[PDB]
Amino acid sequence: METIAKHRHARSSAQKVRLVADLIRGKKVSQALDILTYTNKKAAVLVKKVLESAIANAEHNDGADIDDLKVTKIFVDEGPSMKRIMPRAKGRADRILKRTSHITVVVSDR
């Protein structure tokens, strides 16, 4: 059983959510939830929603007893970025990268 759970085109940048991912990597879901609950980042709530969805898929589509579940594979990879032109001084123009990322969560009992 794998019960993956992906959230693509997340608003936050891939880097900024990796810090949150490292906090819960390898840890049991029980401690994962509270850590994300009390972490002061939007990446915390962004990742928390994905982790909640992953637990729901495991409980519903697969075996119950979500208590004995651990986040085996947590990773983030940057996704498509949006190009925006922003004026600067002296009439110059620069490109603003509204970066996005895909968050993948894998929770397994063993």
Partner: peptide
Amino acid sequence: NNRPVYIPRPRPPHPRL
């Protein structure tokens, strides 16, 4: 994706004379 159109005149160099 337009290449920069207006390039400003370069800053005058220090006189090495």
